[model samples]
Target: MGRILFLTTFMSKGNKVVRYLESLHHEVVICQEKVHAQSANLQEIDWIVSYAYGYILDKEIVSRFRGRIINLHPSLLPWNKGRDPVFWSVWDETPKGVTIHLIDEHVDTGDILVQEEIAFADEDTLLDCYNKANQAIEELFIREWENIVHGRIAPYRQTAGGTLHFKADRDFYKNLNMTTVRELLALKRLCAEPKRGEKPIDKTFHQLFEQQVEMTPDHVAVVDRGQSLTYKQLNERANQLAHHLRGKGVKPDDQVAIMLDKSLDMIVSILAVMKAGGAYVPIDPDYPGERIAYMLADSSAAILLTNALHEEKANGACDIIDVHDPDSYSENTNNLPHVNRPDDLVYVMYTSTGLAKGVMIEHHNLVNFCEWYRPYFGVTPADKALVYSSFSFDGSALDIFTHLLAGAALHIVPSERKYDLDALNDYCNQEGITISYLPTGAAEQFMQMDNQSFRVVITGGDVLKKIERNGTYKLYNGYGPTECTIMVTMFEVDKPYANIPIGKPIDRTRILILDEALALQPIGVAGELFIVGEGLGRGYLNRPELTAEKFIVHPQTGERMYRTGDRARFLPDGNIEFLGRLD
Candidate 1:
């Protein structure tokens, strides 16, 4: 077994730590001294590493390894004599902390191996302040390995007079505010990493194709009025089209505009655009020419992914590449897979009627939202989902990324059904759609049908889920503003509950209930809902004051928290439930 015993004499999450280290596909053995760790032949020992490895060091075990023993301590040892000093790294403003130091076992009084300091900003809560600690943990171990492998680590000692931290308390939120950035936060170990021991959740559009091919290649990944594409076929074709765009100068962060309806070209081209590390701004083809042209001009899209149908309109100013056009002329950029970075701009969407006025998104943030959504809903490609959205509305995410990122199949509801419920049900039933997303008002209209159209329906943007129909479909009423990627919370409705809560926080977002004065409110009391963290967009595209007005600081935490104009209440379940929106 390529396993090393990481004997830590503290809280045990070695599993989470070691697993993070192994994510690079490296093999690691996490041997907790108390869990299950034993010694083997000295001849078989390859290396020795210590990270708060505790007081149980068998010199025999240390001497066995032909390699040097690397020990980790949390202090500038001989100064803070005893226990971990990470608490002081922040609480007492220890100049340097959250680091790994070389070990000698005479308490924290040892030679400094390696050290890093994380400035605790004015807003961190002890309850969730693992950000810097995890960063230091990884850096110390990782740096030691790198140095040994490359043979670069030199012995050094720490400074004198350092402070130690007290036990972290869970009640820290009572006095915390996160709106001000008072200190520089050193991102060591991203405390927000995905759960350990699960399959590498791939939320990237084309990556879903790879996941599907690896899962069920022959399964249909997309179906439309024109034809159906199996996961393998759709993915490969998407990749081909993506490669074609890359050749057309659609490189990373480039703005690629899509002017089309809910057709296959839109699907493939959008995916191709994202694959090329370019963000896509989707313009509804049905929109007036002026509106469509305005979006293209605003985002300054370099390549317009379209068909001959809209060719003349889109070609007025920008370069146009028809996905329907064959790739024979330009083999280099005509047909191939796409490439993209996590942070690259994926699509630049004009949120306001595909007009010049609206917010936008980058690929990295979109990926982060998909990450929160996938596990929250447990969606799969086998799920036949319906798209009851116009390319104009943010609700289109229900159809776009859900399937593109989750491998689910999307059945585009005819635009005629944008107001017609009967036609919507007919389309859903005909396509065998199992799930669909709708506005609370539209879903209420569709519920009038006696036929079982969809197994699940998510209704949000306004109103709550109620048992208006005979409950043929499970409904989930959700809530989210455009500033925060997609809908953030969904209240699951098994039966038409009387009063539905807006439900739980999506992911990294921290939900706070405060008064107009920005002061904390009592539980079950109504107040404005504020959202913060990575899910929060970088404010309005070009409106600085409006962005600042909407995005405010937590009075205590001093961190950026969206001061939502909506009012809400916290339920006993530790989740915030919707009440109503404020003026």
Candidate 2:
């Protein structure tokens, strides 16, 4: 841990970074006063991290920390260099992103340390773009913090030419048209999101499965109808499919699209894709042909993994690899090298936002979330869970991984059985499921049933209904966007309340309720909730501007926080009460 001179006049924008650095065991001194920094003989500081420091230091002050001073600029530098990059990027129609550069005597001109783009959505306001830029800078610091402090990475002068705009550039937004704004926003979303480095869990899902296989080879890992796959069976089948994907050039970060319903093959194919060092992109077979085709095209999926039953649906665009055909197998079951990192892309789920936008979740984000939730929800190795969520939803990823990580039995609800309350109730009673998550609509129907076999019944994604507790079951109202890993805030229900609160941050998360001006709102006052935590997703897949719009900086915290458009308020008891959406 390096000692850093945390230089920023404002408490809201840079202090959160100070907290994070201190969390990592780094020594940080808060120097908001320029005079204090210049006058104090603070030569002992190992690194200097600046965020929106209003004053410019002379050569004497700058020379004290050569190649050690890093500044966080909320813009894709070499384009919008000077002040108000977020506003100028939108008004002048320039590329937008977060940049970490070495500070010099000049304004924003410095050697580029690292930069990541923030996409703007067509429907976004100036505030949205600013959020993305702010979030991007925090992510950059998180990504390159170690190397930056240790001076491990070399810096180079910015190659791309850029124009700077001072505050006097009034005509910049005088006659801006919506057409140019939309074009710029669209361009931001089209750019692929930045991939950060992370130390994932030491073992992959397959390796985790193998550990359980050694203990209980005959124990069922996943079940579908009459067929059940034990730990040994699942591993071998997943290994076979993984080898097949590797033969077709499915490398890390490469997307292997899987378009199949919930089944043993579907589970095997997904694990195989990960084992083969590629992210699995789930394409719902129930989706319309045009929608499916569009997803395959948008993801640029190299191979489409599906069963022979859906060959026609899978063959239009990418190469279709049948997971069920035994003869099409690579008999060589030797384990492939684990080439995946925790930061590697795990899966890309295209949610139907009327136009089907893909949300990419990384390995680290998923792993961190599962670890935090396992004990909170009372999940254990002896527990069984029903897969009510579909493949296309991010909720399914959480459902699948958390159970698998715990060495719990996973039961996939048959396509026909799903949405069928009788069948679902029958299956849950038969399997004695300890935990299950459902959308508000599905949970409403299930809530009316007589059975109370489930230890935990989780529900969200819509306004939660009054779930009358029948027995010892715990009902949690979990709330989070697809951008954040899965559930950021969860309210465990016990007694009946006037309104269901979204609760507080689960764990490893920070929440701030702020007004339109980004200032903290008093308790009981409605404000937008900004969330920042380990569970945060990498960003929208190839949707930089939109990613920038939603994930922003906390004006006071100086940490990356998602600007939940939904209005909320903090109660006296420290729980957050959810209100209607602003937009």
Candidate 3:
């Protein structure tokens, strides 16, 4: 059944009321009542329920709406109506309670949908009365919403009301004391859902053969410099490689190293490792021989997945198995089972660390980030995604993965021109690319390129130099740490405010900007960026202290928020604006 729709004000009463509705498995969306001017798509909203909601709804939202639109009060029917419904009732000692009704053009003069009596005892304060009212509300609201979902409850004008309620504000909270806070707690009808939290992921990744097999088996899966494979073909090839590896004594928990270019074969090998219940550590073939050797030895991989071209080099380091050499190997297994747990290590890489370090990702450690900027920017699979990133960086994770996740085609550019803007543009146009991850493209390449050419472009890893996009395609300024996985915050190009805002938090995360002393600086002040949310990575495999120092206690929430070394400030619009990076 479609969940019951509930709207509440930022007031204590509204909080109480929304909580009241939630005990019945109703879904509530927090619409900042004060900021109704920002959203224009409210008419299509199913039902509008009000609980101490201050933001008024004009005709554009109510008159012709499809579902029931209602509001609640704190006094007797047709007797006491208006903002501070509880305040006046309390002074009068006249059973200050709560009411639920349909609200429209008039302040709080909508029809009564639900109403319940509020009791205030001599010992009870304003808050006590509010809390009591909420309890009563909770008891009278929907016992069942099956009819509401099935369209049995139609929208109708209210036939009851005497006075109108405006909204309760600061004085409301100021008027209450500790005792009243306890009482209002009783009068308010908010039943909060149990809070859920844990250390989590904050990034994106590639679409391996298996993901393709499940979601788009017939779609093209792997595309390299000169070839491509359908999802079905990719999965079959992965099975063959898994069979060969298993036949060679590869077992679960083994660490296999992959030192290859971004090619169709690379996908085959990684999937093969997962199929064999082993973790695949990707070593960029582009790394120097010494660095490659260091990673091979550090990971202590049972065997390295390399091609004939790098076989000589791989052998020099340690035990090496070339999957592409003459008489080396071919895919030979089918129906290779995926026995690895979600928490098991998947692919490990040193993408984040500079000369001093690198980061790693484990499977059960994360889920594919399909709901990245797309949910806000309106990016879709129909948008051809441009791969303007190096396969080694985390940026590539968003580009390659989000596109495939959305069923969009991916266009991988030549490695040589990744830094060449003109070539990048040509590649985007050639592939009809609509989405691309850029380092600072909003300032550099994008300022020069015609945005009319693509559907969406996200620039991250640095500050955006350009404030305005062509107003043609959607552009977003995103930010995140390799330590966190991928960009966690994004500001859709057009919707942003004048200074080219940073962005609001991505779905699963929250960001805080604090001064040098670790105190939260006001909205416009510059401070350190700390990200807290679902996408945090497991600490550095061997460096615990370093991980602890960087990801510290969240300032306000006290949660373990990753101290993003980058600097930023939040805009008044609830969007964060990028400053620069710190240490």
Better TM-score candidate (1, 2): 2
Which lDDT tens digits does candidate 3 get at residues 452-544?
Answer: 567666787766656554436666677777777677777777653445677776666667676665654544557887776665766565667
Q: For each of the candidates, give the backbone clash count.
A: 34, 9, 45
- Expressed as tens digits, the lDDT of each residue in 45-135 for candidate 2 is 8888888776677677688787878899888888887766777787567777888999888888889888887888766766667666676
Which portions of model 1 miss their true places by more than 4 Å? 1-205, 328-339, 353-356, 416-418, 494-499, 552-555
The residue pairs that clash in candidate 2, if any, are 12-556, 118-544, 119-544, 119-545, 119-546, 120-545, 131-552, 132-548, 200-342
Tell me model 1's lDDT, rounded to 2 decimals. 0.62
Give the TM-score of each candidate: 0.63, 0.65, 0.60
Worst 10 residues of 1 by lDDT: 183-192
Highest TM-score among the candidates is held by which one?
2
Candidate 2 lDDT at 235 equals 80
Q: Once model 1 is optimally superposed onto the true structure by TM-score, how far is the C-alpha of residue 414 displaced, in angstroms?
A: 2.7
